[PDB]
Design a protein around this ligand. Structure first.
Ligand SMILES: NC(=O)c1ccc[n+]([C@@H]2O[C@H](COP(=O)([O-])OP(=O)(O)OC[C@H]3O[C@@H](n4cnc5c(N)ncnc54)[C@H](OP(=O)(O)O)[C@@H]3O)[C@@H](O)[C@H]2O)c1
Ligand SMILES: NC(=O)c1ccc[n+]([C@@H]2O[C@H](COP(=O)([O-])OP(=O)(O)OC[C@H]3O[C@@H](n4cnc5c(N)ncnc54)[C@H](OP(=O)(O)O)[C@@H]3O)[C@@H](O)[C@H]2O)c1
Ligand SMILES: O=P([O-])(O)O
Ligand SMILES: O=P([O-])(O)O
Ligand SMILES: [K+]
Ligand SMILES: [K+]
Lengths: 244, 244
């Protein structure tokens, strides 16, 4: 099923590791031109060795001022994948001001900032485009010790809908994908213990966690014109967790 | 908190046992006039003995024609509680035509028929009113062997919403209540295995099942003018089941 990403310029945040890195790889291989944004330069360095021709951009997206100086000069971007996030887990009664702030600055405020930059350029060129926000299964279902993280993702699902509403007349689509655990570093830091994992597994009808590949496939579908009448949506990649 | 039910005429379906029976008693105590509809006569005989003054109507609500003949002549009814239902549990691959038909005739078609009769009368008298549909936590979360039952409750939630929409201009509110397991006869036949109740109990934050009185409290709030701007909703009485 052609998806018409060959040739397009795509920006991916949090591309150094995990889902964002596999997204860059998938995109490169299909022919799109990629701008890889990430916090750690050594991740970008290896990625430009593996995926020749991408453009690396190293910046901490939690810093509004520094992001604007690094990204303002990126140029024409057709497609955008907002993937960077942090997961700072704390029981509710132990949540601190600093964990709150950092989590919201990276997981949500950055999503606004980068999206504005790409959406202003699409409008100025008068062309259509698409944005995918990587959310989570726990945007809609509570998990212990995840009150701050799950609130950013709950906020992100809603941000996705207002973006979709306000950007729809400029033919820019905006969608979220909501995966279950993925055994990236972020998932393995938390669900590596056979027992905690087990309690989640028993709730997943397909009886397994997601692979990076499942997530990328959903991302690529939502970026392509194949999903031309889908916007404001939250696409689950959670093996059926939300259904039961 | 005055909910001003005294003096109005309320119809309750499935009044012979469980939540419906508990609803009739609560209303009876508050001075409302109750029409009690149920399938089994002996259930209504003892109900009239404990709550003198209620009007019993004995009829099988799955029978459209008998219901019309039984209820067409019931008089001014201000408030309606659609509580009667059947739970015919079969694995999806064993669902039969008969279990399907019987479940939808009782759990949904009867809701339409009795609500039409009550809504027509209210509109003729030009007075406001309120309808509560008793739904379920399984209206939005799947449970094994409940494909038909959960579908009737999912249909009920949505019916509630269209009812709310069309009857809104006539000052009739329509809401649903969505309880977790309750240890009526309906709850005791399924969840009586200790290992059974355990699976679900661990997914309920308040760590217990619902009592009849919790459900009745919610029905009464939704019938009262205390909930005057609430229509088309599904109020969970499930100890937080839906939240995680
Ligand atoms: N893995 C799962 O269990 C899972 C489940 C549901 C949803 N998700 C979502 O999937 C997305 C990716 O997660 P993942 O598992 O791929 O995580 P990961 O393996 O930890 O990678 C996240 C990437 O984002 C980068 N990043 C984080 N904060 C940054 C910042 N302030 N500025 C620039 N880049 C930053 C990280 O860089 P550094 O490592 O250099 O900091 C890393 O390259 C997230 O939005 C996450 O919430 C993941
Ligand atoms: N108990 C639970 O765990 C639970 C959980 C979530 C939601 N709910 C909902 O709560 C409501 C009541 O449940 P419950 O536990 O109170 O059930 P129950 O104890 O079995 O009582 C149901 C009542 O409805 C009557 N009824 C059933 N079919 C009828 C028909 N065709 N015509 C006339 N009357 C009929 C029954 O009469 P007969 O017994 O004489 O047939 C009985 O009096 C239902 O809508 C049920 O789906 C119950
Ligand atoms: O809700 P998560 O922790 O499985 O992403
Ligand atoms: O009606 P249920 O969801 O308690 O089985
Ligand atoms: K997670
Ligand atoms: K049930």
């Amino acid at each position: 099923m052609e998806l018409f990403l060959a040739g397009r310029r795509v920006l991916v945040t949090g591309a150094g590791k995990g889902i964002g890195r596999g997204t860059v790889q998938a995109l490169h291989a299909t022919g799109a031109r990629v701008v890889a944004v990430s916090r750690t330069q050594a991740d970008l360095d290896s990625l430009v060795r593996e995926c020749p021709g991408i453009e690396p951009v190293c910046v901490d997206l939690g810093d509004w001022e520094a992001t604007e100086r690094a990204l303002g000069s990126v140029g024409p971007v057709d497609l955008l994948v907002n993937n960077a996030a942090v997961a700072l887990l704390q029981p509710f009664l132990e949540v601190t001001k600093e964990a709150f702030d950092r989590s919201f600055e990276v997981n949500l405020r950055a999503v606004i900032q980068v999206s504005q930059i790409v959406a202003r350029g699409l409008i100025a060129r008068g062309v259509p485009g698409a944005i995918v926000n990587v959310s989570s299964q726990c945007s809609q279902r509570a998990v212990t010790n995840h009150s701050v993280y799950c609130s950013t993702k709950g906020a992100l699902d809603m941000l996705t809908k207002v973006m979709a509403l306000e950007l729809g007349p400029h033919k820019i689509r905006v969608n979220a994908v909501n995966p279950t655990v993925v055994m990236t570093s972020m998932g393995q830091a938390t669900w590596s213990d056979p027992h905690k994992a087990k309690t989640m597994l028993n709730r997943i009808p397909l009886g397994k966690f997601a692979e990076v590949e499942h997530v990328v496939n959903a991302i690529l579908f939502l970026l392509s014109d194949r999903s031309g009448m889908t916007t404001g949506s939250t696409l689950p990649v959670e093996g059926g967790f939300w259904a039961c």
